[PDB]
Amino acid sequence: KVFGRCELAAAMKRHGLDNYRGYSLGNWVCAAKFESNFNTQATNRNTDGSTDYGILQINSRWWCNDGRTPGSRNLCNIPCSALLSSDITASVNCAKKIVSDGNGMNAWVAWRNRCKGTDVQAWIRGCRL
Numbered sequence: 001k002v003f004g005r006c007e008l009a010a011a012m013k014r015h016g017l018d019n020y021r022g023y024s025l026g027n028w029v030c031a032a033k034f035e036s037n038f039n040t041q042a043t044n045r046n047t048d049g050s051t052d053y054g055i056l057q058i059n060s061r062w063w064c065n066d067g068r069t070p071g072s073r074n075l076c077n078i079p080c081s082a083l084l085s086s087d088i089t090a091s092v093n094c095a096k097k098i099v100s101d102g103n104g105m106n107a108w109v110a111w112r113n114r115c116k117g118t119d120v121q122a123w124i125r126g127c128r129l
């Protein structure tokens with residue numbers, strides 16, 4: 001499923017990302033945009049053999065099991081495919097675990113590179129929340 005920008009902002013809030021660990025909703029929306037273009041089914045192979053999945057491109061090296069990332073962990077205790085669902089519950093929950101891991105959203109390199117330091121409020125501007 002490919003969400004609309006305001007559609008994704010509302011769902012992320014309903015799912016509690018709003019100011020989670022101090023990250024306002026616009027940070028999350030911004031990250032989702034650049035990681036997956038708002039597409040729950042997005043996947044990309046990393047040069048190390050791991051793969052990123054879903055709207056926030058969560059990695060199989062650490063967070064989910066996809067059965068083909070040797071020596072990896074499954075910290076979110078979920079199969080990576082659950083991160084590709086129209087239902088963003090597993091991606092949201094696993095994202096909360098990641099942002100809580102001590103480096104916050106810097107875990108998302110694309111957030112650090114394209115959102116951090118910018119006016120992220122623009123991502124939820126216009127949206128009824």
Ligand SMILES: [Cl-]
Binds near residue numbers: 072
């Ligand atoms: Cl594996």
Ligand SMILES: [Cl-]
Binds near residue numbers: 104105
């Ligand atoms: Cl932080």
Ligand code: NA
Binds near residue numbers: 061063064066074
């Ligand atoms: Na894994």
